[PDB]
Design a protein around this nucleic acid. Structure first.
Ligand SMILES: [Mg+2]
Ligand SMILES: [Mg+2]
Ligand SMILES: [Mg+2]
Ligand SMILES: [Mg+2]
Ligand SMILES: [Mg+2]
Ligand SMILES: [Mg+2]
Ligand SMILES: [Mg+2]
Ligand SMILES: [Mg+2]
Ligand SMILES: [Mg+2]
Ligand SMILES: [Mg+2]
Ligand SMILES: [Mg+2]
Ligand SMILES: [Mg+2]
Ligand SMILES: [Mg+2]
Ligand SMILES: [Mg+2]
Ligand SMILES: [Mg+2]
Ligand SMILES: [Mg+2]
Ligand SMILES: [Mg+2]
Ligand SMILES: [Mg+2]
Ligand SMILES: [Mg+2]
Ligand SMILES: [Mg+2]
Ligand SMILES: [Mg+2]
Ligand SMILES: [Mg+2]
Ligand SMILES: [Mg+2]
Lengths: 70, 117, 154
RNA sequence: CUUGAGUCUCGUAGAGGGGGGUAGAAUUCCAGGUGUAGCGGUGAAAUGCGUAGAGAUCUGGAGGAAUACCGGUGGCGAAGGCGGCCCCCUGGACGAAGACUGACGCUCAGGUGCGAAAGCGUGGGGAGCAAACAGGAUUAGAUACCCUGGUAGUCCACGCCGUAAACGAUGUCGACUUGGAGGUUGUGCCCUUGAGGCGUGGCUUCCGGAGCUAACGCGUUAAGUCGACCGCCUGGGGAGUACGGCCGCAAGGUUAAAACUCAAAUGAAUUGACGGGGGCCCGCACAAGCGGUGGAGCAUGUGGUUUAAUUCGAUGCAACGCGA
């Protein structure tokens, strides 16, 4: 996440760009995940859970949440 | 005794501690400071505020060298990662470039085992 | 409470000087619902203080308060299972109340004979900034400074 | 005879397998520069490392292992499994049109092969991690969880072992039976007018009808309707154990009982209760405050002890100035 502060760019603005760049890159997330060894089985299981939850939630929202709530 | 005007601020921001190190553009270190040496231990040195005061201390230390421009290289996942740069700017350097140099492997060495807490 | 933003209650101003702050001080001082006695003590203390230090009763009293109010106190935020002492800026009504409370406690402690005498001495000390209530404020501030790392991470 | 089964022609996608090179990032170590008192770690510490100059930072070098992003309920494989890039050898699947053989097929007890990880033998290698082990914490203890270290092992070659919740807890092969939304990979036509319209194959994910099921659920990839063959079960424990056999260097694997003992053991779902589950909410529940009790004397009640009797009852909150 390289940033160079442009001419007449405020510092706060520069900081904002830097943070955005880092978030987009996903550096913190990568480091956190690589902090400890996740077993392959654990990684697979987590992936499966994420996929299932995401799919179920999407289905519930779009199709199940098409009714009169009140 | 020497003057350089333009330095690099290497902000090593681990979870436990923040190390700030001002250096010449080549790599040679001028002054450093940590939250530990800044007077914070444990829960207090693992905070953004501690990082900020460490940064202030570092700036004071390298005041002899008369550094005016400064590019900051942030490393690691840390509570500071922002406080240090804010503090440095307040201490009054022109921040020119801000770069992240956190070392991610390309699936290399095995990490240590997961903590059971 | 859980579900209450109750209205602050009405305190009448003291008859001699017409001051709400002074009335509150008298209330804090009072014990056993004996208001008359408390007001007599407060007035005696004020009169002595005015004579000793200067200008008026209310101005002297204010000066003492200024030297004994705390800007910041600490609370114990208990979120991560352990308790962090966090600093917090003390709002004005609390600042006055806390300062008054500290002053009265210090006066009660103090070794002079009459209550009025103790109060007058304590107030004068506060004005100078070498007394015990002031010491208490200093201690509170010292703690806040120590725990400044936990200020805006509650 | 050609519809099952196979052969040939042309393409397609693929972490399918075996061998050999190579790339960059990162960790470790080594040497050197800068530089100075801390670093590391945790809930908090300490062990550990550092003024014999560490950690930080730049340069160079060594070496091992693994391939970020792409990356996907994506793909390939009989399963186990397979993930940087390049080459060499190599197996299968699928589609298109035809041509060919002419039931050549399905299943399979014994048998044979393949078979994660750990483990074993011999010879290498060894960065990181890490059983064992050591020290520091925590604790009533802590032969654990946490921390700092750390050896087998993890890697390579070649042998062995032969097991896993080796799971879809679902044997293989074939036929038939309403649908919807996707993914992936072919292919025919439509002007691809654009990413696009209508088909037709393969594999694949979810939802759901009839039907089935104890229910949960399955539902054209069946747990539906059927046919062929195999494997396996017959209450819980004893026990996948003993003995015998076979196999193995060993660890052990495989085959596999009996006495004795009980009247249950189990599956799914229901209503509660409970959770050091989750969401929302209240109450002097905490918080903010004020005043007490626990120390003293005395009053009173209780326990106890004493007594001839110390009447009987109340005795976690919700008995103890209570019946009185
Ligand atoms: Mg660790
Ligand atoms: Mg391939
Ligand atoms: Mg295939
Ligand atoms: Mg067999
Ligand atoms: Mg192995
Ligand atoms: Mg070996
Ligand atoms: Mg060996
Ligand atoms: Mg280790
Ligand atoms: Mg360990
Ligand atoms: Mg088995
Ligand atoms: Mg498996
Ligand atoms: Mg089985
Ligand atoms: Mg077969
Ligand atoms: Mg279904
Ligand atoms: Mg029996
Ligand atoms: Mg056996
Ligand atoms: Mg045997
Ligand atoms: Mg309270
Ligand atoms: Mg008492
Ligand atoms: Mg007593
Ligand atoms: Mg009692
Ligand atoms: Mg009785
Ligand atoms: Mg009784």
């Amino acid at each position: 996440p390289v940033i160079k502060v442009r001419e007449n760019e405020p510092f706060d603005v520069a900081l904002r760009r830097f943070k955005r760049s880092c978030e987009k890159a996903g550096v913190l997330a990568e480091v956190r995940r690589r902090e400890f060894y996740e077993k392959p089985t654990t990684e697979r299981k987590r992936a499966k859970a994420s996929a299932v939850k995401r799919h179920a939630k999407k289905l519930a929202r779009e199709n199940a949440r098409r009714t009169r709530l009140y | 005794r020497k003057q350089v005007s333009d330095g690099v601020a290497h902000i090593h921001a681990s979870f436990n501690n923040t190390i700030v190190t001002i250096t010449d553009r080549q790599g040679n270190a001028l002054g450093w400071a940590t939250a530990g040496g800044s007077g914070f231990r444990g829960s207090r040195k693992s905070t953004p505020f501690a990082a900020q005061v460490a940064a202030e201390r570092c700036a004071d230390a390298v005041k002899e060298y008369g550094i005016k421009n400064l590019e900051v290289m942030v490393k690691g996942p840390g509570p500071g990662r922002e406080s240090t740069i804010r503090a440095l700017n307040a201490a009054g350097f022109r921040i020119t470039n801000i770069t992240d140099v956190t070392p991610i492997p390309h699936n290399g060495c095995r990490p240590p085992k997961k903590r059971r807490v | 409470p859980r579900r209450r933003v109750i209205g602050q209650r009405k305190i009448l101003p003291d008859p001699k000087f017409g001051s709400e702050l002074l009335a509150k001080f008298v209330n804090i001082l009072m014990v056993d619902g004996k208001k008359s006695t408390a007001e007599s003590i407060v007035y005696s203390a004020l009169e002595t203080l005015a004579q000793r230090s200067g200008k008026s009763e209310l101005e002297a009293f204010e000066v003492a308060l200024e030297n004994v109010r705390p800007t910041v106190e600490v609370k114990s935020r208990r979120v991560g299972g352990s308790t962090y002492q966090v600093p917090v800026e003390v709002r004005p009504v609390r600042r006055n109340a806390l300062a008054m409370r500290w002053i009265v406690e210090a006066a009660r402690k103090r070794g002079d004979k009459s209550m009025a005498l103790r109060l007058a001495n304590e107030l004068s000390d506060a004005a100078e900034n070498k007394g015990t209530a002031v010491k208490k404020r200093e201690d509170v501030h010292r703690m806040a400074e120590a725990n400044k790392a936990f200020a805006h991470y509650r």
